[PDB]
Amino acid sequence: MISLIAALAVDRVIGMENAMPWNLPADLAWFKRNTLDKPVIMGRHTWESIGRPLPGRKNIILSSQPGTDDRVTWVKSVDEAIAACGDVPEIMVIGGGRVYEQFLPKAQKLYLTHIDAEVEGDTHFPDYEPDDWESVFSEFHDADAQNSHSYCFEILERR
Ligand SMILES: NC(=O)c1ccc[n+]([C@@H]2O[C@H](COP(=O)([O-])OP(=O)(O)OC[C@H]3O[C@@H](n4cnc5c(N)ncnc54)[C@H](OP(=O)(O)O)[C@@H]3O)[C@@H](O)[C@H]2O)c1
Ligand SMILES: Nc1nc(=O)c2nc(CNc3ccc(C(=O)N[C@@H](CCC(=O)O)C(=O)O)cc3)cnc2[nH]1
Ligand SMILES: [Mn+2]
Ligand SMILES: [Mn+2]
What we know:
Blueprint lengths: L1 E7 L4 E3 L9 H11 L3 E5 H7 L7 E5 L10 E3 L2 H8 L5 E3 L3 H7 L5 E7 L7 E2 L8 E9 L9 E8 L1
The structure holds NADP nicotinamide-adenine-dinucleotide phosphate, folic acid and manganese (II) ion (MN) (2 copies).
PDB class: oxidoreductase
Keywords: Rossmann fold, dihydrofolate, tetrahydrofolate, NADPH, cofactor, oxidoreductase
Assembly: monomeric
């Protein structure tokens, strides 16, 4: 099973100038909880924006170019990325935009955080067909002293 996990601002914005223009520690805790002890697949731009290996996860990077860091696994196609994960229950795809686009057709689950923030962006989550997905979990949170915006955690499963 393949799952996507992402945080979306208004209009499905997910990034700007290779960074995320918000700080929501609650969402990062959610990200960590849902990805720990699982392989994570990311594109090269996302690897660069993160800047180091994510601990306690097998880090797999998609690049058409040879790898430049042996602390992570480098693969050159979607099929190789999947094979590199082995036989695990759940593979987590952590973006960015181009990688989300390619793995969406294969995904059975989406872990989405909807953030009530208006940000200009240059990267967007794919336009997924809402009829194909069932919402099985949602949990809304108002803003607080640590999290500057309200946000909703949602898990959707392909029908
Ligand atoms: N809000 C969120 O949940 C979230 C999550 C993740 C990322 N982001 C944001 O998204 C942005 C980065 O996304 P992005 O779309 O620009 O880049 P990306 O998808 O992270 O990486 C794109 C790169 O991945 C490699 N790649 C993708 N598909 C491949 C394939 N099939 N075979 C071989 N290599 C492949 C290529 O690297 P080469 O050029 O080396 O071939 C490509 O240039 C940043 O702003 C980041 O902060 C946001
Ligand atoms: N829901 C969600 N939120 C995100 O911010 C997010 N970010 C990416 C890619 N960007 C990043 C950037 C930083 C870290 C990170 O530093 N996480 C650490 C710390 C967790 C914490 O602070 O509690 C980790 O161990 O996962 C992860 C992904 C992909 N999917 C996401 N999905
Ligand atoms: Mn080596
Ligand atoms: Mn807001």
